[PDB]
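Archive entry. Fields below.
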Amino acid sequence: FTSDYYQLY
Amino acid sequence: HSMRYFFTSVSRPGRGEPRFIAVGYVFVRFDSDAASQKMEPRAPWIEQEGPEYWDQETRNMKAHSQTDRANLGTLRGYYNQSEDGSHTIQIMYGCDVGPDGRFLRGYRQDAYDGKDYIALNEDLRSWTAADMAAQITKRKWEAVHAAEQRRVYLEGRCVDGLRRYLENGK
Amino acid sequence: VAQPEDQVNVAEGNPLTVKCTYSVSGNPYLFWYVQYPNRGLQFLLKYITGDNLVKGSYGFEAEFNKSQTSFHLKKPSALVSDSALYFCAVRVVTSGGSYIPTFGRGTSLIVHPYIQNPDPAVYQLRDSKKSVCLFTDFDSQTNVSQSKDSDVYITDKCVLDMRSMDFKSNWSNKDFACANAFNNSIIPEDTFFPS
Amino acid sequence: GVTQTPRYLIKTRGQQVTLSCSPISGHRSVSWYQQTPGQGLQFLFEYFSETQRNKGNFPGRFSGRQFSNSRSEMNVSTLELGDSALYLCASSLAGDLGTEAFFGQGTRLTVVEDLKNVFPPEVAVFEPSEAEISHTQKATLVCLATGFYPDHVELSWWVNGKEVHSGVCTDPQPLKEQPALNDSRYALSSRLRVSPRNHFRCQVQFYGLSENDEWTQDRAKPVTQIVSAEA
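PREDICTED_STRUCTURE:
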């Protein structure tokens, strides 16, 4: 469900 | 039974802030230029999840919108692409599960301007780069053990969310 | 995380034994946090993947053991500065992928100093015009207990560090005498009491 | 580091407080902690770019919010006696498992049931005895911060007008003058040991009452102030 871990580039 | 999240992020220069599309697939659609400005659903069997999910996910990808803005600004440096304007990011993370609902394999391959970028392997611990700029992303996504955290999401809210999604069929 | 020993007593130069035990329904993503006095929690070391024998800041190390389900912060050389509240934090990774840090109840590692030449004395200090009596320069073996009268107050032993000298050392308004307020607990029989 | 305001604060029961936290430059994730002497360090709630991602086990009167620039604020409205603790804020990059976690210096709060129990500390410094000079050829000074409540005191020794961490050993915990009642009048003490132009000063910075709290008791008002004792 759209991981709250949105890792940055 | 997959779970894909195609995160279309077009900069849309001129008018202002980037115009973001968050079509996910098993589903949902966060058009940042729509009227709702909330996580409007595009799937029948997602309405059964209540305010413990709608607000959580809405704020989660409100955060993800700023994350994609930041990463798009980052690729302004990485590729050193033309600053003339529009440049689209295509996130494609997710994971497959067996009919048992356990973690079969995970896949987080990145796609900037249609082509390839950093890509996650079958081991779910080591990525696979695609060009000179992707190795920079390798450095930081292997240094902070982001591989482990994306694993436990793929062995997690990916697996658990897709479990609940398969359960959505009553 | 369950840190069993509330007060760990380690001499200067002994194997530190800050016991950490974790109970999680998942992989151990372990973390050590030192809380120096008058500051916040600072990062010591972490075990995510790779070597069981890990290393961290300030010379600390840990041995992630499946044979003990323990993550003992070990340090062969003890410093007085190690006297701090050590938190063993296991970051139980949420299904989403966000770390929820759950800490222990706190281990008060006192790191009792090894006083080379104790010479205990009890000398009184007067005001700038109540008076305090000070018990000092005693070995770490002595244990101090509180007093009986509510007028009489006893201050805990304090490990002051002469880092410029590499030296260490650990009241009432009433008829009250500094030769008293010492029957409370064990005292060194050679304690110096200027009457 | 994660700069936090207010540093120390006192209120009464039912009064509203607001604490502020600003993460590291570029950090976009913020966690909140509460440190009780009894229950240890409890998780309050975690924000990440205008999104509360995780929350702890606290009543509904603990609330927080983070603005667009990653700055987060914490406020408490109905103050019960269990709200006496140190409130910590954390930072991160995106919630990475290996990005460490930079914690702040915290804000310690204590809720007085009545305004009359808040007092300014009475601080005096006791000159060293000549017995110590004859015994160990050194000198130790025993300060006393007495009659202050709550114990939101930053007892910092300033030798020659500057904060010193060498030779200073201040009590980890002040002792209660009168432990019978729920409140107290804690009497603190400190030992500064050195080897007459020195200026050993036992600054007990009391973080007392604020201007918002109306006061009806007869005596003087002990707002946040400086009570300095020198020898």
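CURATOR_NOTE: Chain A touches chain B at residues 1-9 (CB under 8 Å).
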